[PDB]
Design an enzyme around this catalytic site. Structure first.
Site, PDB file in Angstrom:
ATOM      1  N   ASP A  74       0.825  -1.226   0.000  1.00 47.95           N
ATOM      2  CA  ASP A  74       0.000   0.000   0.000  1.00 47.95           C
ATOM      3  C   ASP A  74       0.855   1.271   0.000  1.00 47.95           C
ATOM      4  OD1 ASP A  74      -2.223  -1.694   0.122  1.00 47.95           O
ATOM      5  OD2 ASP A  74      -2.768  -1.170   2.197  1.00 47.95           O
TER       6      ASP A  74
ATOM      7  N   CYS B  95      -1.518   2.181 -12.990  1.00 46.39           N
ATOM      8  CA  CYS B  95      -1.670   2.026 -11.539  1.00 46.39           C
ATOM      9  C   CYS B  95      -2.885   2.959 -11.211  1.00 46.39           C
ATOM     10  CB  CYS B  95      -0.396   2.377 -10.755  1.00 46.39           C
ATOM     11  SG  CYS B  95       0.284   4.027 -11.083  1.00 46.39           S
ATOM     12  N   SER B  96      -2.810   3.878 -10.236  1.00 43.32           N
ATOM     13  CA  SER B  96      -3.898   4.817  -9.873  1.00 43.32           C
ATOM     14  C   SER B  96      -3.808   6.128 -10.702  1.00 43.32           C
ATOM     15  CB  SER B  96      -3.825   5.145  -8.377  1.00 43.32           C
ATOM     16  OG  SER B  96      -2.508   5.538  -8.015  1.00 43.32           O
ATOM     17  N   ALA B  97      -2.769   6.972 -10.423  1.00 42.74           N
ATOM     18  CA  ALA B  97      -2.538   8.218 -11.165  1.00 42.74           C
ATOM     19  C   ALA B  97      -1.735   7.949 -12.447  1.00 42.74           C
ATOM     20  CB  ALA B  97      -1.831   9.257 -10.291  1.00 42.74           C
ATOM     21  N   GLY B  98      -1.084   6.790 -12.514  1.00 41.39           N
ATOM     22  CA  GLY B  98      -0.316   6.381 -13.686  1.00 41.39           C
ATOM     23  C   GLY B  98       1.042   7.038 -13.804  1.00 41.39           C
ATOM     24  N   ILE B  99       1.660   7.353 -12.686  1.00 40.14           N
ATOM     25  CA  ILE B  99       2.960   8.040 -12.711  1.00 40.14           C
ATOM     26  C   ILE B  99       3.988   7.399 -11.785  1.00 40.14           C
ATOM     27  CG2 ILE B  99       2.000  10.251 -13.605  1.00 40.14           C
ATOM     28  CD1 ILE B  99       1.754  11.294 -10.600  1.00 40.14           C
ATOM     29  N   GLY B 100       3.568   6.902 -10.621  1.00 43.34           N
ATOM     30  CA  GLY B 100       4.508   6.357  -9.631  1.00 43.34           C
ATOM     31  C   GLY B 100       4.992   4.968  -9.928  1.00 43.34           C
TER      32      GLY B 100
END
Ligand SMILES: O=C(O)c1ccc(O)c(-c2nnc3n(Cc4ccccc4Cl)c(=O)c4ccccc4n23)c1
Ligand SMILES: CC1(N)CCN(c2cnc(-c3cccc(Cl)c3Cl)c(N)n2)CC1
Length: 475
Positions: free
Chosen positions: A375, A409-414
């Site tokens: 997480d 992923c979520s925001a698509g950057i990390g």
């Protein structure tokens, strides 16, 4: 510029800096005394500290919004007044004179060996001499050393102007090159490269970066370069595209965005060119159809999902695929989930994609869903991620004229940037073997000019080194 970021200061140092050298509306950002950030602002004669959190997905500002980079955050709030709150205004950056996050600053340094080996015409560096500094330049070929006198908090090359920082001096002599008596122009074209390593020498570099850490200094120097990547994100700001973004202020660069053929051409996704990739956010209920139109148009055959649908009780990506053996229509696109295979760290779903009314358009889309990423932070061992990328790579390679690999992923950057960068670096080692040159921050800067904030944290940055090290160790 990114002078408003001070890497080596405390909250008290920040308070005293802002009270004695700033005015109302004066601001600075700084790392937390770890993995978190503080935005310190002077308002009505008093200093207010605002927490910024990054666990690896985005920069989360207390009482504000979510951003891809600190530079995008500052650029936004300096342009949009009333958005930070009792409203707090970012009017004047309070500049940092510390040279530690400059590409050319090499504290204690030897410098002639590096310039002779790695350098070219215009390669320069700055080092600590007592309390004075040395500017060493390569021209051709030869190396020239310029002494930099530090006299009463000001810096000079023995005559003319006295600069408040080594950065001001460097920038001045970058635009106005020193000419030697016999005509040699001391062109400061580019900082000497010290990050490019030979792949076989990764364990040595990881060891040096682990010393008191070096990984932090190298990452913050990369962070300082993000102010050069503030490209237009206009399409994502359009009224009709606002609800198509998971995070309103995390937008795709217009120049690399995936264009879909009233306003049916938008998706929060970017093409990443090193085998190409598409880096995108987790689907919204209202973007599931746009997602399948993108997959179909791009001829993508492989999707990499690096998040669970729900994390910490929060939706990260909606279920955009049918249940096993089921068939679903998502607008004009039809998807069948043929079979699901479970492995330790991931699930593989074999999907069949086709356009409704046209049977001959059918193609198999392989969805690799990584389910064991923590997480917060990164995995303690890269073996799981490496085995996963190896399989994804082999699927992609087996499919003739397959389009870019879809990564989200979520925001698509990390996590997205982390998986893509690892995949780029390992690919060089596949094609060129153990005897190849890899440059981790150069690879990241290149991906980051194609999508904002690709690779979010220092923990992800270190994970990329650990993953490359592990891949080379199992060769
Ligand atoms: O028009 C151009 O050629 C051009 C060139 C370079 C750029 O950086 C941009 C631009 N693109 N996005 C932005 N945002 C973000 C923003 C605005 C509105 C809603 C959400 C978000 Cl998250 C800025 O705050 C911004 C601030 C000042 C100056 C340009 C900016 N800018 C445009
Ligand atoms: C001691 C020091 N100040 C910290 C480490 N260091 C450097 C140098 N160069 C980069 C670099 C390399 C390629 C692309 C990009 Cl954008 C960057 Cl910034 C880097 N990340 N660190 C040397 C100086």
């Amino acid at each position: 510029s990114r002078r408003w970021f001070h890497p080596n200061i405390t909250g008290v140092e920040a308070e005293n800096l802002l009270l004695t050298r700033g005015v109302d509306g004066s601001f600075l950002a700084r790392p937390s005394k770890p993995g978190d950030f503080t935005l310190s602002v002077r308002r009505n004669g008093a200093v207010t500290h605002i927490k910024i959190q990054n666990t690896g997905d985005y920069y989360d500002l207390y009482g504000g919004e979510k951003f891809a980079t600190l530079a995008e955050l500052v650029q936004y709030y300096m342009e949009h007044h009333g958005q930070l709150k009792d409203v707090i205004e970012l009017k004047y950056p309070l500049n940092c004179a510390d040279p530690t996050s400059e590409r050319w600053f090499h504290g204690h340094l030897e410098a002639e060996k590096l310039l002779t080996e790695k350098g070219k015409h215009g390669s320069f560096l700055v080092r600590e001499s007592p309390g004075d500094f040395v500017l060493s330049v390569r021209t051709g070929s030869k190396v020239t050393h310029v002494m930099i006198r530090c006299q009463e908090l000001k810096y000079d090359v023995g005559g003319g102007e006295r600069f408040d920082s080594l950065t001001d001096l460097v920038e001045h002599y970058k635009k106005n090159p020193m000419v030697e008596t016999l005509g040699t122009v001391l062109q400061l074209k580019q900082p000497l490269n010290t990050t490019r390593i030979n792949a076989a020498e990764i364990e040595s570099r990881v060891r040096e970066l682990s010393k008191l850490q070096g990984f932090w200094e190298e990452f913050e120097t990369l962070q300082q370069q993000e102010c050069k990547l503030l490209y237009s994100r206009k399409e994502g700001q359009r009224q009709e595209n606002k609800n198509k973004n998971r995070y309103k202020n995390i937008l795709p660069f217009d120049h690399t965005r995936v264009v879909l053929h009233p306003v049916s051409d938008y998706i929060n996704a970017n093409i990443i060119m090193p085998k190409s990739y598409i880096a995108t956010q987790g689907c919204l209920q209202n973007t599931v159809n746009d997602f399948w139109r993108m997959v179909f148009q791009e001829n993508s055959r492989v999707i990499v999902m690096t998040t669970k649908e729900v994390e910490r009780g929060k939706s990260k990506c909606v279920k955009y695929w049918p249940d096993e053996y089921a068939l679903k229509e998502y607008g004009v696109m039809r998807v069948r989930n043929v079979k699901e295979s479970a492995a330790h760290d991931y699930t593989l779903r074999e999907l069949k994609l086709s356009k409704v009314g046209q049977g001959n358009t059918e193609r198999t889309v392989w969805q690799y869903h990584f389910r064991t990423w923590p997480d917060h932070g990164v995995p303690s061992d890269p073996g799981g991620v490496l085995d996963f990328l190896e399989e994804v790579h082999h699927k992609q390679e087996s499919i003739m004229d397959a389009g870019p690999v879809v990564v989200h992923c979520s925001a698509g950057i990390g996590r997205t940037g982390t998986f893509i960068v690892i995949d780029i670096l390992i690919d060089i080692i596949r094609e060129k073997g153990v005897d190849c040159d890899i440059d981790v921050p150069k690879t990241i800067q290149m991906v980051r000019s194609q999508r904002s904030g690709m690779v979010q944290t220092e923990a992800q940055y270190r994970f990329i080194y650990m993953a490359v090290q592990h891949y080379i160790e199992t060769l």
